[PDB]
Design a protein around this ligand. Sequence first.
Ligand SMILES: O=P(O)(O)OCCNS(=O)(=O)c1ccc(OC(F)(F)F)cc1
Ligand SMILES: *Cc1c(COP(=O)(O)O)cnc(C)c1O
Ligand SMILES: [Cl-]
Ligand SMILES: [Cl-]
Ligand SMILES: [Cl-]
Ligand SMILES: [Cs+]
Ligand SMILES: [Cs+]
Ligand SMILES: [Cs+]
Lengths: 394, 268
Amino acid sequence: TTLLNPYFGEFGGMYVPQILMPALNQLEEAFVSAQKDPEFQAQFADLLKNYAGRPTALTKCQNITAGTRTTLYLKREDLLHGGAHKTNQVLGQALLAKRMGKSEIIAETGAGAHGVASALASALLGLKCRIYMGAKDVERQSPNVFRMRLMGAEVIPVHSGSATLKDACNEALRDWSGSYETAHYMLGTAAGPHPYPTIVREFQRMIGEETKAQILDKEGRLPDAVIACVGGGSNAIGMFADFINDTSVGLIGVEPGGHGIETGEHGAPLKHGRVGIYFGMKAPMMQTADGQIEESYSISAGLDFPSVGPQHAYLNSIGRADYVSITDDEALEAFKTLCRHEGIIPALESSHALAHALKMMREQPEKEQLLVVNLSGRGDKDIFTVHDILKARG
Amino acid sequence: MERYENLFAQLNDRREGAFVPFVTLGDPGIEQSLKIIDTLIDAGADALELGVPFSDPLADGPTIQNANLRAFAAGVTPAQCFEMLALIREKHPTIPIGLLMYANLVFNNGIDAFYARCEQVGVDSVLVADVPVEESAPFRQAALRHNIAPIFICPPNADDDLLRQVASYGRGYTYLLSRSGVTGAENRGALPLHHLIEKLKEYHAAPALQGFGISSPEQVSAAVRAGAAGAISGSAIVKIIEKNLASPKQMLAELRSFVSAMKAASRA
Ligand SMILES: O=P(O)(O)OCCNS(=O)(=O)c1ccc(OC(F)(F)F)cc1
Ligand SMILES: *Cc1c(COP(=O)(O)O)cnc(C)c1O
Ligand SMILES: [Cl-]
Ligand SMILES: [Cl-]
Ligand SMILES: [Cl-]
Ligand SMILES: [Cs+]
Ligand SMILES: [Cs+]
Ligand SMILES: [Cs+]
């Protein structure tokens, strides 16, 4: 039994070994309690404001829409401490860990963004942090690995399975299965077993709350659509949550199309995968015909989650949200365009959301539309990746 | 069929416990795996627990992670595993055969169709490692419709409500976890399980088999002495495979010796 519904329609659930069920129930109870606790809320708000720098700007981008009937704002999660939206929910999960009397943090990371966010929160709040990372990711994310270590976190390479994110996800759960009495598992997206999809949403929803206030202040009305990239679903659900009951507002999630959906080399399970059960949840996922889990491909390492949060699959099923894909090449063009016309270097993850907005504008330039793109992170980390392509391309 | 019921009745008549090895199907290849399994039975295994190779075995420690990887290196697929299972049953009519599955492999092509395939090849039970009792309904229902025992896990700290659920819903045997954590012979369970064993019997649960970290004869004898119907050993068996990959003949000899010793410890 649980306090909250573990499902979003058919999607979600608690598909963990029996030994972990008390951990999930304890976390759910602590979360429900925290949400009613004005002191917890004030501590969270204090960290978000004075440490992370919220509220984040909403930037009107006039140059890129010139000559069209599109008005485009960017919600500037790139300006949050750490340079990505992940900071928001790590701070809240760290406070939940404390609330439960836990002194240790376990986290998974692929590209390293969640590992660094976890390590920084742990440093600030006096938790001992250990981070699992696939051996292949370790080798290729030296900068992030070094940051995690500078911040006092232990980084543990994972050599099992495919030595990437899903394997680090497994190793974190294996550790937690034996350590849950003292350690909190700080899951990095709006996915996995209940209560994680719900907790991550609630600890990211200030993105959309702020966006709504900012757009009412500047435009006097709600947006026609809000657009966000979808790796596991945290930044998107963070932007979408406060608009779900505003039926006029379009919710558009953008999965990575990689080399092209037709190539099979993509990370778009919501629209192009098959429902499965893995990482604690029933959700669309990248898998072989006989049910082995596969990897997500994208130029952006941060969109590498081989599944998607169950609330997104639900919002799609009922037609509340629409999901599309953007290829590597489209993302790269959007990256270059924003740099040159707006003086902002976006994360390649966020560039997928911008690319789709640019398509909405370009395809129908005399359509009047007020759009918000969630700029989930900054793209300093991506300049070498973009360097190497632009050079090999000529 | 009623293979577990018949085994436990026969073992009761001999005042013996069950010794149940685990191996991964197709580790280190199909032909050698079939030989391994025949050896386990000939050496005294009372029942089998058999894993289908899965990409993400999140309840398994390194020994069994590596067994899964060896099977994949040999190209082993679930379809090939089901072929193996049919042949094992064709050779051995009465030994209970249980599978260790992960949820996605059961759900993949439909839950009902998975259990129907199990029935066709003569499997007796299925344990789905990542489905807790809370999520078990469509699995246990499909199992029972196809004459398959759904195996439930009883953790060492199970409360009364969970014990009642496991007792009601399970069939074949009740899996009594030695400890928290994941499979592996390097960590031995150090919690007394006699109170759980007594409460399960009170609730007419399927007979208990203790598993996780069982790697020596004294542990088998201890499981029986505490009231369990027997014990399961996985990593310790798989370690012998891993140790002896270079010598298939010595691998079988060492497996025989080990299983013989472990089974002997079950008689008293
Ligand atoms: O001897 P060990 O320590 O290797 O343990 C052998 C375990 N093999 S098994 O198939 O019984 C088995 C039983 C339950 C498992 O996970 C679960 F409890 F979550 F369901 C995993 C494997
Ligand atoms: C991690 C990350 C993402 C993808 O994760 P979600 O959970 O889908 O938000 C997207 N953008 C940036 C900048 C990230 O760091
Ligand atoms: Cl308000
Ligand atoms: Cl218009
Ligand atoms: Cl029963
Ligand atoms: Cs349901
Ligand atoms: Cs404009
Ligand atoms: Cs994805």
